[model samples]
Target: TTTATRLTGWGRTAPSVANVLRTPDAEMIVKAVARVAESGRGAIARGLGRSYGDNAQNGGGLVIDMTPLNTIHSIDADTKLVDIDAGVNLDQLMKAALPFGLWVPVLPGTRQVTVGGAIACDIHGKNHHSAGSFGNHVRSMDLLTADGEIRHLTPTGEDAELFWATVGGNGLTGIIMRATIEMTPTSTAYFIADGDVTASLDETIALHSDGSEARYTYSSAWFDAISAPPKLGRAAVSRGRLATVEQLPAKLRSEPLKFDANKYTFGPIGELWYRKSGTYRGKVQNLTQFYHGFLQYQFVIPTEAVDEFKKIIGVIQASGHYSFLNVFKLFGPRNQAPLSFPIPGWNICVDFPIKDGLGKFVSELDRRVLEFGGRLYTAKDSRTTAETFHAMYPRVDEWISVRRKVDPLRVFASDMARRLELL
Candidate 1:
């Protein structure tokens, strides 16, 4: 049984009502889908509601609250493999793995996202240049299809086609029931982070372009989007690797691998630190901050357009629209997932407050990014026209075709799919 619920994404801008069923097990999920499929209004699975867009909302249709299904079934410390329910979030997984000296290879900025949400978005981290996206680390998944059958899918084999499609398919193909991911061994939770303050956008780009600095597992740049001159477009380029036990302070060595499960909310203090120091060094981020009270536009552009991308940022600064928490990352090769956002390029994510003319500004920026052979991240997008979406993701047609075979009646849908004409 389901109940009426009003929901919105993390941005809290768009709201919709749905008949949401908090399913506790595979049987309940199968039954819920069968019931919703009969109504023909469609259904979609929703995780922690971290997506800044409507990719999880179905409006008048059925929405499955996957959190109730949270369960960590197995952990093979020998093989470094774990099987967990899709609803289980990274925060939970991190705490569970840290004690065993294992960690998820790829993590987005926040640890509040569920495994299902991470796969849906095919999320990438600062280490994308080395580790790739979340989908790249997945070994297999249990998918609850529109036909009410749970199918086991591996990266290779008869179900490989469906598996790849479901990775970044955004829940349009099916509901991810459970997933198995390979974890990496970590000696400690700290990172040996260091970097320099870049005086200009060109300097930042040059620092990133120099392949020598890419030796570190993680690298990124943070810029002040509001300042002018000597500081305009200035950024802090930083890189980090897993810190070893020997690197810890003498007092901290007593419990080098201790796991702290505390959640840290993003506040003004951290923001001020990034603003003051073009870079932060010898620090470990215990809790990841959630980007609340802001709108974000994140894009992946080819490496050739670094200059043009900088100029685009200038356009934003010229408008006097204050933006904080701007980030840049280097990406490696693309994955097989048709709709996956990364593609061997540079990616930038910038946040802006909701204000007048924001829509127009984003639209124009979208056009410029497209011209530079880039595409917007669907998980972060709240406003993108179908025309632009089609141009951005040329593989959308292939995804739609596979989805039609699996869901001829379009039994799975979301407000984002409707808004972007994905279904």
Candidate 2:
């Protein structure tokens, strides 16, 4: 089905009308691309539209809905690998693969994300410090190029250049049709986790960097962003690793691989969460929480620039605005993808309600982020200018060259592409 409809990212602040064409397969998608390419307005493939910005919107142009193409081609239980269409959502893949004791290597906060969206944005998860971004687990993928031809891509294949570009390329290089990815093996769905309530921001930083968090596969913190001087930036830290079969209690031994999450009990951390969490040790928890859908800032800062992170928190608290969701996590070395956001450093996300002095505040924050060798995550970006984006991602020029090589006709443009001057 094809119709003219208005679309927006999760933010719903920037909406654009386009001809939405639901593509069922590669053959039909090729025809649609050819037809749209001739119009010169350009086109981009859209998955579940989970990006927080305009990454998938093509105003007055063509937007190919890739959801209809979603299909689980195969789940190789022995090999622990799966072949799936790009539009396959994480939730769907998990439900099918979990029964086989195979789990997708990287899972973002939400499983509603499609494989295409995941690759395009190159999402990182709770265990990013242990595992890499979503692109690292992909063994191979089929990219539908602007020429209406599907090219098989691998990390070490002849099309490796295009492959790397497409992984974190934000759907600019081409359309992701289907992918073969390596799945992690897990004997149980539960995670063994612990939390700490820190007195100050410095303590939180030390806990993350003092060579202790390395013992856990996933570690993160939530800090108080609305408190005054001494107590400002007080944090609650948590760390966890996958629990094995024997780790489960006698009651849970009956179903080690039980997929139900609501059945687990967890204690809180922080003054309220931490004070109430005295009984935290015995049970299990599988989910970590992060509140989104509001205007927030997400950035990654290098380890050497710890002061920069501290200064930002102080500034936010001084503003007298009640900010929340002060999450802090770590990232390992980035993969071969040049455009990928993660670098070996600290990633933070905090929400600030729109209020007075807002415009100048974020601009100053951006300057600090750039000055301290930090970069903002584009998946949560809706306001960054082209100059700032270029400054942040120094390898963007190299990415642009590869993009031009594959899409010489400028046949793939989105509202975000034009907004950021990507094309």
Candidate 3:
């Protein structure tokens, strides 16, 4: 079945129409892409619609909805590897893996995203200082390419470039049909955690940088982006690691992996959801968009450029742009995926209201990040131009070359592909 749908990213910036197919299997996906190859407008695979920008929207072309193509073929408890359909989401995997004392190695702060999206985005989590990004854990994949063929990809050996390219290729090279992930072993569902509040950016950066010898496996900080100059960049830092079976409470040891749906923690993008109907309209249950509508800008700078990173905070503050949320963290080594965002340095993400001056302000920030050998996260972006994107990710030309090799007909593309000139 097909629907002429209006689709946008999570930010709901610029929406467009596409013929969306709720793909049921690999065969159907192949059939759809073959038609799209001749469509001229191209096509893209969308899972969960969780991408914050128009990365999933095809714009008057084909949008392959991948959510329904989920299936967990098998889980190898001994090898700690799980073979699953790319469309299976992290939440579903977590619930299923927990019973086997396993857990996904990385999560992008939210679990609603699908495995295909995770690999395409090469998402990172708080534990990135230790585990790297989602692509690092992937062992192999079954990729549906433009030639109407399924190609087997492995990270090393003959398939290296295509595999690495597809790892964070944003579904431009092909659609990931299935994947095998080497899940992390965990005896309990709980984490041993800790937190502290820092009074200045200096102190926060010092602690995160100098405390590496004694650092936890997972670490993240939230900065107060709107604070005064004296207290600018003050932050709340948190760190955690999986609990060992021996560390569990007596009452919980017997069923350490037990998961209850009511279990707590909190996170949400915002409200003012658009409900689709015959008319495709909405009622303001919560008008966050009407009043507090915002966009997120996330960038990473090299560890050596820490002082410049601090300067960026001062720049935003001086410009009078307020960030409703500011998160800061350090990353470890980056993988071979050219478009993957995380590097060994500082990542600061700010959520600011969409104001008259947002574009200029964000461009200023983009310049600073680029000058200091930093780059923006494409997955979280909604408004960076092709020139700026090309300047940020130097390996993009290499990535595009792979796309050309795999999708010469441009069978795979999206609004983002057009915006960034990725193809």
Candidate 4:
């Protein structure tokens, strides 16, 4: 039995005031774009619907949802190279490649994102400084353009302009049908993760740049501001690399590499609660736990608060009560993508249980981020204002320049684009 499709991003709640088309195949997407293009209508490509903003939403235009095109098309073990459908997810690709002693070089906070979506936004991982964006490993890809033509492109292709534009074009220039990416070899299944706790924002930043530590693949820090004595700068940092068999339990020394096929969850109640609440929050209630907790999340904040939010990293570090994991990791220098999330500075994310007045707290915090010359991540944003969008993405006009040439009829428009006047 087939059911009508609906589109939504991983955040589970980016406001949408438009209908998004869910195409089941690349050919179908091409046909949709062709039809609209013939009539001078514009379109945008979407994958896993993961963008926190309206990058994929087209209010009155057409949205070619890319989930159906997801498939692991090829893998070359000798070179640790893999080719996959644009809609294939990182988790699925990892599972398929691990047996060959290979893994995606970089990954974001979650594994639910699609290849096309990942490339379009130039997604980064814990090792951004070392590896850069996922685009760094991209060898080639097939793009479905606005004219309804399928063209193959490589990093050094004559059509390099289109290739780079599509890397972070937000699907404005074309739809990604397939992507060829390289994988990394891992010596162990488990990672030797090191943890450090910082007591203040200034100290946390200092630690991030100390660089006394040896070469590592992953690093990240946590901040909590709600603890006793005003833990404004409290932070936890972690750096991870593959762990050898000797570092594992006796039950699994020879077989240092193992994969969990059935798929499982991580952490504990705090993780579940924090996930449900979405962003950082407070309050512990005597309530049953579910998937995501009770939190009405939104964009990071208005443009005025971007700097303030970055400054409040320590505040968030001091805000949470953590019995388990508090922060994730930082990869290396990421590849370049117009829409890539990470810049030169630290990429800090804090998870908190939903508490009352979180909006107010984050509002103040966002200002710090802006003052610090930073921007909130689009994948996690649900509460930023139009002004903030303009401030952070100053290259909006450049992105729009490509969009205008690609889809001039204004047929594809989401609430996000419409509100920000991208349409």
- Give the range where candidate 4 is weakest over 10 consecutive residues by summed lDDT: 283-292
Write down the lDDT of every candidate, Cα atoms only: 0.83, 0.83, 0.83, 0.62
How big is the positional error of residue 125 in model 1, measured in Å on the Cα after superposition?
A: 1.3
> Candidate 3 on 1-423: residue-level lDDT in tens?
679999988888789999999967778788888877766888899999888888899898889999998999998779999999989999899888988889789977778899999999999987898999999999999999999889999999598899999988889888999999999998877666655666678878887877751557777877878877757987767666777777777787888887751222121211111111111212211111111278888999999988898898888877778886788888989999999999999888888888898888788888888899999887889788899889888999988888899999888889999999996
- Which lDDT tens digits does candidate 1 get at residues 160-191? 87888898888999899999999988877777
Model 1, residue 349: distance off in Å is 1.6
Clashes of 2: 4
Once superposed on the true structure, which residue ranges of model 2 sit more than 4 Å away at CA? 261-273, 276-283, 287-293
- Cα TM-score per model: 0.92, 0.93, 0.91, 0.76
Best by TM-score: 2
The parts of candidate 3 lying over 4 Å away from their true place are 261-292
lDDT of 4 at 136: 79
lDDT-better candidate, 1 vs 4: 1
Which is the winner by TM-score between candidate 1 and candidate 3? 1
